[PDB]
Amino acid sequence: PAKVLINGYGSIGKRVADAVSMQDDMEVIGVTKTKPDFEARLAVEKGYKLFVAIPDNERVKLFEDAGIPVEGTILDIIEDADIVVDGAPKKIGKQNLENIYKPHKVKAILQGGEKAKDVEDNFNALWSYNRCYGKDYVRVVSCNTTGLCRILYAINSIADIKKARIVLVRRAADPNDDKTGPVNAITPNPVTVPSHHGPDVVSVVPEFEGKILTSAVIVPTTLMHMHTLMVEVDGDVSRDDILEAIKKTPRIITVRAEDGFSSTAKIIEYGRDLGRLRYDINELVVWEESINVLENEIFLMQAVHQESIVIPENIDCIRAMLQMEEDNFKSIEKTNKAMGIQ
Amino acid sequence: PAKVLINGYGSIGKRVADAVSMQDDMEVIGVTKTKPDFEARLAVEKGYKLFVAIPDNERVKLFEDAGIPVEGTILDIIEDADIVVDGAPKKIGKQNLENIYKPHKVKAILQGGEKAKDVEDNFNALWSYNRCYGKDYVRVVSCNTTGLCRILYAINSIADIKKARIVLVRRAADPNDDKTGPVNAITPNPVTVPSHHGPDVVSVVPEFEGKILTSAVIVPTTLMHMHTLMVEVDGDVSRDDILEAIKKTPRIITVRAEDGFSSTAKIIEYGRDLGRLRYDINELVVWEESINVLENEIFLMQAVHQESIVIPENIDCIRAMLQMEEDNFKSIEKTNKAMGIQ
Numbered sequence A, B: 001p002a003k004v005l006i007n008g009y010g011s012i013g014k015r016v017a018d019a020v021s022m023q024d025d026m027e028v029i030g031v032t033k034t035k036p037d038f039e040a041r042l043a044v045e046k047g048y049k050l051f052v053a054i055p056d057n058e059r060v061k062l063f064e065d066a067g068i069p070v071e072g073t074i075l076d077i078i079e080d081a082d083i084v085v086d087g088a089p090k091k092i093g094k095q096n097l098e099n100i101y102k103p104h105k106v107k108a109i110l111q112g113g114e115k116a117k118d119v120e121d122n123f124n125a126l127w128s129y130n131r132c133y134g135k136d137y138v139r140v141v142s143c144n145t146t147g148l149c150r151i152l153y154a155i156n157s158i159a160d161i162k163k164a165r166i167v168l169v170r171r172a173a174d175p176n177d178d179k180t181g182p183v184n185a186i187t188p189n190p191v192t193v194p195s196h197h198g199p200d201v202v203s204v205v206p207e208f209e210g211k212i213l214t215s216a217v218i219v220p221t222t223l224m225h226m227h228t229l230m231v232e233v234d235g236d237v238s239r240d241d242i243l244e245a246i247k248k249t250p251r252i253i254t255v256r257a258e259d260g261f262s263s264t265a266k267i268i269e270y271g272r273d274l275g276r277l278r279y280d281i282n283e284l285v286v287w288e289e290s291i292n293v294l295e296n297e298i299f300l301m302q303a304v305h306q307e308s309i310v311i312p313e314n315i316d317c318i319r320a321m322l323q324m325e326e327d328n329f330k331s332i333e334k335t336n337k338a339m340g341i342q
């Protein structure tokens, strides 16, 4: 199997570690932490080899004193990896790329908080798997960009996109985060319109240049982001065609407000009750009743579980970069089956 | 002075009562409540005559047992009114119109939760003042509709609107409301797109029929709603033209994120520190840095203080309905001067 190192066992990192372990063709050779906390302990209890992410002997001693077994530092494992999945905080992925991955000549994936310009290309399994094939340094794009890429793939499959206008209503803090607000405000993020979210999608889909217009705010919720879409298309599609295209596209599911899905709280409750690990819904979720077509324009609202949506993308990205699977859909299906998702 | 009865001394009602009092040409002859609470007490302390909103002797005694002075019931005061501002809950305004205002042959204003078909016309001071002139039963439209009316007037002043695409991010509960959620969700409201918000603007501006497309959600905030606008126009407008039109239009002001206005929390902090009564910001608030024009399409974000935005509209509507001033802009200026707003 492919030997995968997870550098940064955090919200993304810990999920990719488990998602890699679920595959039959890759394995986790180590995960890293900087703090000797309950999450570091959980990594060890799960059976992962734990390394200190920063090459600092004093920090290693901190873990040993806290009674958490460590195998060494990032430098003790980096040479054994076929690829590194970087899960480090925003800006730190690029630091690791320049300070560690590149000097050790090892392939690495950065997450969506890093820049398009920091890497060789930008990954979504439906659009740029082939472009990322055999590449060395790739960015798996953000939760929002990932969600937009999927719904835009669905729409593109049945009509040509002329202009996609999207408003993103983003969560303030992940559930674990007890420090970040706002408690009670709506925050323009950014204040400028159109925002950088549109160009981010274009980094994956160059043909959408000048056709994506976004605006975003942050609100006091932790569970999921919501996106609202109004998309002018060239073509005569019906609501049924759009619904069918969404159902056909891997990693998009629909819910019905008629069935009791009144909000993002209900989508997460479904994730919990379904028995999903960490409640993760890696699929983009579209409200069925929101889907409409009026005069060559498609409307819908959708929700993104930001902690988990990019996890299967990381798995497919590994297969692309390591040349493990030639066929993007074959990788998607393999990943999906291993993770128990659609 | 015009003799104004406030039937329903609630969030809107208590504010319209004070705004009427600030005018030199109208007076509040009474306000009504159903429950003997601290708000009933406050009305009395402020010098208003309090009547019981429901003509029920058992209810009058409830007020007497609470030691809150009441002057009688709605039936003891209704025949003295030149006009009734209804401030009752959604659906109750229409009940009051059919059961009280019409049988007593008295003009009445209903609030935005009531229906366009419930009344003779739909009021905003910029657009429909003349059309509502001398009418007997008028709806002052909702917080959201009033805000959209104002920004669309500013834009219409300099270019013809082709399509206005709006996403409304609505507050869950007014500050006083400690019973309504969601605590932690984003809730499509409605799930259908385009939503009823667009046609509500059309009830005011018939020429906007089929040109306004809206979607709305509710989030865990109390302070203000936010709106995002992307508006296709006919005509060559600049950013500076829009900014100027916004500045020129009464009851729209701008704030700069560069000045520390990071969110709706900062806007409210400003209303508080300014010394506004109840911190009310009756003006629509547009973020300056949000205003953009790209290929004949105007972008901006704005915030609406839902509790107070319709208050000065009620005052102007009284003037139109009682034929007190033929010039909409003269009523607007007068209303604004008396309230201390722009």
Ligand SMILES: NC(=O)c1ccc[n+]([C@@H]2O[C@H](COP(=O)([O-])OP(=O)(O)OC[C@H]3O[C@@H](n4cnc5c(N)ncnc54)[C@H](OP(=O)(O)O)[C@@H]3O)[C@@H](O)[C@H]2O)c1
Pocket (backbone or CB within 6 Å): A007, A008, A009, A010, A011, A012, A013, A032, A033, A034, A035, A036, A053, A054, A087, A088, A089, A090, A091, A092, A093, A096, A111, A112, A113, A114, A141, A142, A143, A174, A306, A307, A308, A310
């Ligand atoms: N959160 C989301 O909704 C989401 C969704 C998609 C993409 N992303 C992106 O994923 C990346 C990581 O985000 P996250 O939410 O997973 O952050 P996170 O939860 O804070 O986790 C970051 C992890 O990196 C570790 N770390 C700190 N310094 C490091 C270093 N110098 N080298 C290697 N590891 C280091 C931290 O270890 P300690 O905890 O021990 O300090 C922690 O385990 C960002 O680019 C972000 O934009 C996030």
Ligand SMILES: NC(=O)c1ccc[n+]([C@@H]2O[C@H](COP(=O)([O-])OP(=O)(O)OC[C@H]3O[C@@H](n4cnc5c(N)ncnc54)[C@H](OP(=O)(O)O)[C@@H]3O)[C@@H](O)[C@H]2O)c1
Pocket (backbone or CB within 6 Å): B007, B008, B009, B010, B011, B012, B013, B032, B033, B034, B035, B036, B053, B054, B087, B088, B089, B090, B092, B093, B096, B111, B112, B113, B114, B141, B142, B143, B174, B306, B307, B308, B310
């Ligand atoms: N809240 C906003 O931000 C907002 C903004 C713009 C427009 N509006 C619209 O304004 C209207 C009222 O909303 P609100 O927020 O002011 O409601 P509210 O704060 O709940 O107040 C309603 C008032 O009506 C009184 N009332 C109850 N039953 C009555 C009856 N049968 N007859 C006369 N009065 C009665 C209540 O008295 P008691 O308290 O004693 O029961 C209360 O004082 C709605 O159409 C709403 O859509 C609301």
